[PDB]
Amino acid sequence: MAEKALATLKELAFLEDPSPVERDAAIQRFEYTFEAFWKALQAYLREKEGLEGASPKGVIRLAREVGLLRDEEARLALGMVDDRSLTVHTYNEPLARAIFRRLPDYARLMEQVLGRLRR
Amino acid sequence: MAEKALATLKELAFLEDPSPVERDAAIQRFEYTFEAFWKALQAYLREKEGLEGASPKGVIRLAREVGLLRDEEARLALGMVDDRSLTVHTYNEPLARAIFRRLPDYARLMEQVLGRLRR
Prior knowledge:
Chains A, B: InterPro entries: HepT. Chains A, B: This is Nucleotidyltransferase. The structure is a homodimer. By secondary structure, chain A is mostly helical. Chain A is built from 5 helices and no strands. In chain A, helix 1 packs across helix 5 (93-116). The two termini of chain A are 17 Å apart. The A-B interface holds A 1, 4-5, 8, 12, 20-25, 27-29, 31-33, 35-36, 87-91 and B 4-5, 8, 12, 20-22, 24-25, 27-29, 31-33, 35-36, 87-91.
């Protein structure tokens, strides 16, 4: 689901001044895009590297050691996992706006990583 | 707090034909409203009934066994718990749409219950 889910996210993640509706929607899409994203990395690491990761953070650490993620990408990824744990408290405009400000980078990172995963 | 989160969910829950952005936003607000909702229930049971629940379903059963929720409401509440988690791989149009269809009842249930934690 990665790529296609990533497409719906990009529709809103690059909005300069989103309304509260668009913003909440961008957060929801980030959620399901994230889940599809770490799952694709997990399966890839399993099938192509023989490395097994159980959680989003563990998979990112293995993706880093194998080279799928440069150290900087890795850290941005780990930040993505933490923001994922905060989406359920985005009733607060501050948080919500703060998460939305990071979506641009997350969208690009995921798009670029998925690309390399083409085998 | 939970009533304010719930207020923003009501702005979208009752739309007959939401745009795709309005539907994803309504699902996001259901997630952060339910989180606020079971936490409020949990706090209330702890402080007013000497009952410490530690999980969303655990808190819902306790509220039922204390009279806050009729048996029907409790079954709906438990279904909310399952949905708030399926809200993960949501670009599953069928699923997102099935959850949206239930928002009017979820929103009305939470409004009622929260109303009993005060009056």
